Structure formats: structure tokens, C-alpha cells
Paper text:
Activin receptor-like kinase 2 (ALK2) is a transmembrane kinase receptor that activates osteogenic signaling in response to binding dimeric ligands, such as bone morphogenetic proteins (BMPs), of the transforming growth factor-β (TGF-β) family.
We analyzed the crystal structure of ALK2 and the binding epitopes for Rm0443 by crystallography analysis at 2.6 Å resolution. The consecutive ALK2 residues F63 and H64 that are distinct among ALK receptors show extensive interactions with complementarily determining regions (CDRs) of the heavy chain of Rm0443. The side chain of ALK2 H64 stacks on the W106 and forms hydrogen-bond with S101 of the heavy chain. The side chain of adjacent ALK2 D61 forms hydrogen-bond with the main chain of S54 of the heavy chain, and ALK2 D61 main chain hydrogen-bonds with the main chain of R53 of the heavy chain. The substitution of H64 in human ALK2 to arginine (H64R) blocked Rm0443-mediated inhibition, and the substitution R64H in rat ALK2 had the opposite effect. Our findings suggest that Rm0443 can induce a unique dimer of ALK2 ECD in a back-to-back orientation on the cell membrane by binding the residues H64 and F63 on opposite faces of the ligand-binding surface.
Author numbering:
A (entry chain L): 1 to 213
B (entry chain A): 31 to 108
C (entry chain H): 1 to 134, 141 to 223
């Protein structure tokens, strides 16, 4: 049974930079197949044989290798190249094994998040629960700090975060933080604050509202 | 005279090992599949006298001597 | 050259059975071998099963061998995957793919959108859809809350609005239920005059919600 080790697990490159992704095999194999997978999308054939590009794949891409060591290469890193790249073994009796994958990211200029706060909708309130959403829109890099405050009291253990994958167009991230409270709890308080810390901001940004205003 | 060989495919039911004078790694394009095989060759008084196969469109065979020699060899079509 | 679409996926219980289907464009279907590849959430790709052009050769993964059965119907242009004795780690998005064979190489191609299979004791729950009501630019959205299993699909204005849309990955809450939000940034002048509707679909519960996100005072 063939085991494929991909290296590195992640790497971030500036626009124009040259990239090499490695695929090491536990035994000697004949040829190597490569796939590109974008977020919420199916894996597309990228390189077949060892060095053959699929149709629609830019000449910017390259394949090479022999025996156990195999590599995918990019001559110039672009924004549309942002994806996870998988190598696949095909040249033996089953099983046909994939590598772990290398997530490829694009190094970008520092972009400050545009911050938005959302009170729980009236419908939601009626139903008996309250969710307060804070949006961090179009930022780079991913590392962001969101802190919830309710009447100046720092919130803990009652919020959940989710980050989108790097945008294929502008290479930015977005973040959503949701503070969940029981309706009663929500009613009990007035000021609902979302405090955002990020590199693109010289000092932290607070978006807030008063309940019933 | 007899080596231990890796056994994958049709001739190997349903063992992973094999014993022969030569080990082989086999490939043929069958029914839209690149089917691979590994096993043994043994000389009898008649029939196939050679492990090595005259190349044909769609098929390739490569043979070896030594214990588990077929493990790190796979037949590749030209 | 050939389009493939997967179906039959949904919520299922441990130790129970399910049959996936892969419907082709055709009638080139009977010209290629067929493959199943699964993807667990947040994880890599794992090959499941293989079937040749005329069901001559069949292969299985070792974790799958004995439990699963790959079938084929060239007349109906459909690939099948019979799944039995289903486990917690069988929970994955299931792709079907055609094997392309050249005299030098072979590879997998034309992978479909996939189908979600979930194996758990927990039962089906539909999502509550809530408006995230609304600087030259204003942000608005929908909160898709408390659903099981995945997946949920969100569009804006029946697919007419795509630019500036961020649909966030679902978070599994402490309750064991999924929640996500989808947001869009629009000109603040377009508010009140243009109507924004998020279109939420959760096929496991057979729930469809269309939600007008209106700002008010």
C-alpha cells in the first residue's frame, strides 16, 4: 500500500512568487496525478501523467518527478491559484491513495476589517431566543480578535466564530461572530458592544447598539 | 532457484505472497481500467517459457529476480 | 465531455443501509470506468469504489470492503453505491467520477457536486431563518439557525445577487445543532427601494425558506 506525504501542509506566497508543492511516496511509483480544490467546489483535474496540464489549466503550472519524489510548480503565484492541492496515486493495484493536501494561500496587503453589528431580529425575539451577530468584512490577514461586551461586562463562553476562505478576487477574509443569549437575559441588558482588534487598525474598533433603539 | 514474490490481482486468490523463479509486475488496459497485477513466473516443460512478454498495444510486462523484487517495480506503458 | 450528478444522500442511522446514485449526461457513460471518492468534513479525499466499463472489474477500499456494493446500469446511465452497516466515520460528502483511459495514462475526471451522507443517532431538524437587518455601504444578511444535518444552501435574490456575498461555514453549537450566517454588502441608497431575499434550502428536513430582509426604525 502506497502512502503519499505532501509538503508543506500550508504555505502563503506573494503575487508573482514561485511555488513548489511536494508529494513523497512510501514506495516507487510510475506517475503522479494532481487536483485543485476550491472551497465549496469539487476537485478539478490539474495535472495528469506527471507533467501534463488539463484543459483550462494555465501554463503557469508545472509537474515533475520520478520514483517516489514528485512536485507541482507555479511560475507566478496568482489570486485564482488559492486552493488546496492534492496528489493522487493511480499506478498500481488498489487502493488509490490521496495525499493530505497542501493549502495554498496568497500573501496580500494589510486590509482593515469593516465592522458591522446586528441586533437579534424581532421574529427571533418572538420565538424566545436572542443572537447578536458581529460582521468583520474584507480583511487581511486572518488573525482577528473579537470581544463581546454587554453593559461593559466582558463576555466569555457564549460566542461562536466562523471565517470564510480567502476570496478568489480580492484575496481578503470575512469573519462572523455570534453572541447567543436567552431572550430574558437579552431583555435584562442595554448596551451590546462588539470590540474588534486587527493589524489594519491603529486602535481597536467598537460597534454597538442600545436595545430598543 | 525460487524467490518470494508480491501477489496482487487475478492469479493471486486470495494471497498476498507468491513463489516462483521470477517475479512480475503486469499492466493492461482492460475495459477502461488500467489493471495492474503482480505475481510469479515458473518454467514448465512447455507453454510460456519466458516471463518477459513481447510488447503489444495496451499491455506491458516487466520481470525481475530476487526476493520481493516486484514490489518497487511497476510496468509502465511506453 | 460528460456531466455527473449525485443523489440519494441524507441523514441515516448507525448500522443501517443507504443507496447513492450517480446520474450521467450520456450516452458516453458506457465509454468510461466509474469511481466513488468521499470527503469527510474538514478533511482530505478518500477513494471508495471502482467499476469498469462493463462491470468486469470492481475494486473497494479496505475500510469499505464487504459493507459496500458498487453497481452500474448503462441503459439508465446511472452509477450506484449500496452502503450497509454504516458507521460514524462513514459520514462524508460523496463524489462520483469517471476514469479517463489513454494509452499512456489514466486519471479521474468530471467529479460531480457530491452528495452528503450523515451517520448519527440524532434526528432531523429544520433551520430557523432570521433577517440580519441593516457609510456609503450597508451590510445585511440572514441567520440560518438550529438545523441538523448539513447541508444548507443559501442564495440571494434567487441567484441574481452574488457580488459581495459571504456565506459563512456552519458552526456546530454545544446543543449538537448547526448554525450559519450569510451576509451581503449593498449601497445604502438601494435600501427600502430594492428588495433583498435570502433563499435557504435544507433538503434533509425538506425545508425551504425565502426571507425578505427589511430595515425599519
Amino acid at each position: 500500500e502506497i502512502v503519499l506525504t505532501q509538503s508543506p501542509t500550508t504555505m502563503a506566497a506573494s503575487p508573482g512568487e514561485k511555488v513548489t508543492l511536494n508529494c513523497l511516496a512510501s514506495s516507487s511509483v510510475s506517475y503522479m496525478t494532481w487536483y485543485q480544490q476550491k472551497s465549496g467546489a469539487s476537485p478539478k483535474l490539474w495535472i495528469y501523467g506527471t507533467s501534463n496540464l488539463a484543459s483550462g489549466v494555465p501554463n503557469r503550472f508545472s509537474g515533475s518527478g520520478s520514483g517516489t519524489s514528485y512536485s507541482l510548480a507555479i511560475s507566478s503565484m496568482e489570486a485564482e491559484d488559492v486552493a488546496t492541492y492534492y496528489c493522487l496515486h493511480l499506478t498500481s493495484y488498489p487502493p488509490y491513495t490521496f495525499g493530505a493536501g497542501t493549502k495554498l494561500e496568497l500573501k496580500r496587503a494589510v486590509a482593515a476589517p469593516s465592522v458591522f453589528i446586528f441586533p437579534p431580529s424581532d421574529e427571533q425575539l418572538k420565538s424566545g431566543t436572542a443572537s447578536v451577530v458581529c460582521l468583520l468584512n474584507n480583511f487581511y490577514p486572518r488573525e482577528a480578535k473579537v470581544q463581546w461586551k454587554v453593559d461593559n461586562a466582558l463576555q466569555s463562553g457564549n460566542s461562536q466564530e466562523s471565517v470564510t476562505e480567502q476570496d478568489s478576487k480580492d484575496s481578503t477574509y470575512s469573519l462572523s461572530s455570534t453572541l447567543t443569549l436567552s431572550k430574558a437575559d437579552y431583555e435584562k441588558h442595554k448596551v451590546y458592544a462588539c470590540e474588534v482588534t486587527h493589524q489594519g487598525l491603529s486602535s481597536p474598533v467598537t460597534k454597538s447598539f442600545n436595545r430598543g433603539e | 532457484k525460487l524467490y518470494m514474490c508480491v501477489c496482487e490481482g487475478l492469479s493471486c486468490g486470495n494471497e498476498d505472497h507468491c513463489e516462483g523463479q521470477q517475479c512480475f509486475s503486469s499492466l493492461s488496459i482492460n475495459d477502461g481500467f488500467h489493471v495492474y497485477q503482480k505475481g510469479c513466473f515458473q518454467v514448465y516443460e512447455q507453454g510460456k517459457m519466458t516471463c518477459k512478454t513481447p510488447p503489444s498495444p495496451g499491455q506491458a510486462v516487466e520481470c525481475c529476480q530476487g526476493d520481493w523484487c516486484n514490489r518497487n517495480i511497476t510496468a509502465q506503458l511506453p | 465531455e460528460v456531466q455527473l450528478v449525485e443523489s440519494g444522500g441524507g441523514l441515516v442511522q448507525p448500522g443501517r443501509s443507504l443507496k447513492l446514485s450517480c446520474l450521467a449526461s450520456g450516452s458516453t457513460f458506457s465509454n468510461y470506468g466509474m469511481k466513488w471518492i468521499r470527503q469527510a468534513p474538514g478533511k482530505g479525499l478518500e477513494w471508495v469504489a471502482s467499476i469498469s466499463r462493463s462491470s468486469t472489474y470492481i475494486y473497494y477500499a479496505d475500510t469499505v470492503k464487504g459493507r459496500f456494493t458498487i453497481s452500474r446500469d448503462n441503459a439508465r446511465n446511472t452509477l450506484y453505491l449500496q452502503m450497509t452497516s454504516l458507521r460514524s466515520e462513514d459520514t462524508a460528502l460523496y463524489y462520483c467520477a469517471a476514469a479517463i483511459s489513454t494509452p499512456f495514462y489514466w486519471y479521474f475526471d468530471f467529479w460531480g457536486p457530491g452528495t452528503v451522507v450523515t451517520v448519527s443517532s440524532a434526528s432531523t431538524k429544520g433551520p430557523s431563518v432570521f433577517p440580519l437587518a441593516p457609510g456609503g455601504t450597508a451590510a445585511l444578511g440572514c441567520l440560518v439557525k438550529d438545523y441538523f444535518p448539513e447541508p444548507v444552501t443559501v442564495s440571494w435574490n434567487s441567484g441574481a445577487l452574488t457580488s459581495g456575498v459571504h456565506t459563512f461555514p456552519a458552526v456546530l453549537q454545544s446543543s449538537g445543532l448547526y448554525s450559519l450566517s450569510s451576509v451581503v454588502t449593498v449601497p445604502s441608497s438601494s435600501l427600502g427601494t430594492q428588495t433583498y431575499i435570502c433563499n435557504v434550502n435544507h433538503k434533509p428536513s425538506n425545508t425551504k425558506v425565502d426571507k425578505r430582509v427589511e430595515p425599519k426604525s
